[PDB]
């Protein structure tokens, strides 16, 4: 069975402009385990992004946390772009600092 990833883009701490923080993209509920996750800054791929170790839920679906250091600003806009076998085109979810 194949399942499509749910996506949540958010920050480790409540965002303050000018204050260092972490940008997170939590992908979950997907199968198989192969997946591609990019964090974007104003449309551009952020080079050094890390992720947690591969693990799965009770229903056997996988989850990973992709993260990177960032200092949020008023101007700067961020997103998470995920591609999986269950997706025809890479899905892009924008960061909302209130979600």
């Amino acid at each position: 069975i194949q399942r499509t990833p749910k996506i949540q883009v958010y920050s480790r701490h409540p965002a303050e402009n000018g204050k260092s923080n972490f940008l997170n993209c939590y992908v979950s509920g997907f199968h198989p385990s192969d997946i591609e996750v990019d964090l974007l800054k104003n449309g551009e791929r952020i080079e050094k992004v890390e992720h947690s170790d591969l693990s799965f839920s009770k229903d056997w679906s996988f989850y990973l946390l992709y993260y990177t250091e960032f200092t949020p600003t008023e101007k700067d806009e961020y997103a998470c772009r995920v591609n999986h076998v269950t997706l025809s085109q890479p899905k892009i979810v924008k960061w909302d600092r209130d979600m």
């Binding site: 069975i1 194949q2 399942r3 749910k6 949540q8 958010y10 480790r12 409540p14 972490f22 997170n24 939590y26 979950s28 199968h31 198989p32 385990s33 192969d34 947690s52 170790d53 591969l54 693990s55 799965f56 056997w60 679906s61 946390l65 993260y67 209130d98 979600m99």
Partner: protein, 275 residues
């Protein structure tokens, strides 16, 4: 009130080398070890502070054991290919989770050893730690073989033995984090979506463990069908986040209270929006 779990993932990938094997270890909601066969130098590695104190015989032995387990899981991927009459050019996955839950007294409550092939149930050790649940015909072949080999008794020897004993040790070494009350740092936000309505959102941040309840009430009764719940998510620092949202008629906000339950809290919080 505590648990230790190991999650093994073996994935075949024809054209991309040997099948990949990943193991992660958790105590409650805290990951403490990892293994990845793809790493430049594959070893069992620490992912929690309180585990790093274990000596070379722990990290060397766990590394040798993971390398051995990886080879066996590769063997098992091949066997499954034969059970299911599948092609060697196909890509498949074995997932196995095993471990023990112990009570507040520190004694075994339940042992686990269950698995999936390609995302679906395969075979599982039952609560009696003596019988199996095979999910399909291919897994009935395995069940047949494991009964002869007295596999359940040996799983049971681990689950009553090393599993509970090491879990008890881990809980003691990391008592300051693993047994600490970390209640959520809560607040309620407000953003009017229109003239008619507005969005109430109840946040719960920085909590451990992940288990939490966020419910909205109107005049004291849950708006279960109206409330939008997001999945509990990792903060990246071993803590978790969650928010419940409900859309309410502007002016009637005060009818709505956000109720928060967590084990790090003295007693359940009741929140309201404030300006």
């Amino acid at each position: 009130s505590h648990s230790m779990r190991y999650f093994y993932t073996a994935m075949s990938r024809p054209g991309r080398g040997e099948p990949r094997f990943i193991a992660v270890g958790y105590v409650d909601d805290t990951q403490f070890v990892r293994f990845d066969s793809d790493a430049a130098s594959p070893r069992m590695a620490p992912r929690a502070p309180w585990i790093e104190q274990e000596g070379p015989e722990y990290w060397d032995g766990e590394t040798r054991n993971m390398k051995a387990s990886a080879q066996t899981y590769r063997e098992n991927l091949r066997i499954a290919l034969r059970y299911y009459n599948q092609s060697e050019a196909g890509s498949h996955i074995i997932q196995v989770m095993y471990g023990c839950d112990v009570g507040p007294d520190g004694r075994l409550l339940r042992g686990h050893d269950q698995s999936a092939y390609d995302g679906k149930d395969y075979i599982a050790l039952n609560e009696d730690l003596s019988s199996w649940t095979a999910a399909d015909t291919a897994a009935q072949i395995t069940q047949r073989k494991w009964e002869a080999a007295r596999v359940a008794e040996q799983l049971r020897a681990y689950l009553e033995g090393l599993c509970v004993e090491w879990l008890r040790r881990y809980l003691e070494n990391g008592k300051e984090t693993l047994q600490r009350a970390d209640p959520p740092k809560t607040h309620v936000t407000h953003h009017p979506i229109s003239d008619h309505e507005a969005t109430l959102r109840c946040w719960a941040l920085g909590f451990y463990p992940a288990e939490i309840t966020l419910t909205w009430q109107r005049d004291g009764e849950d708006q279960t069908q109206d409330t939008e719940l997001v999945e509990t998510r990792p903060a990246g620092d071993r803590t978790f986040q969650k928010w419940a949202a409900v859309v309410v008629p502007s002016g009637e906000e005060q009818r709505y209270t956000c109720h928060v339950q967590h084990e790090g809290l003295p007693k359940p919080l009741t929140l309201r929006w404030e300006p």
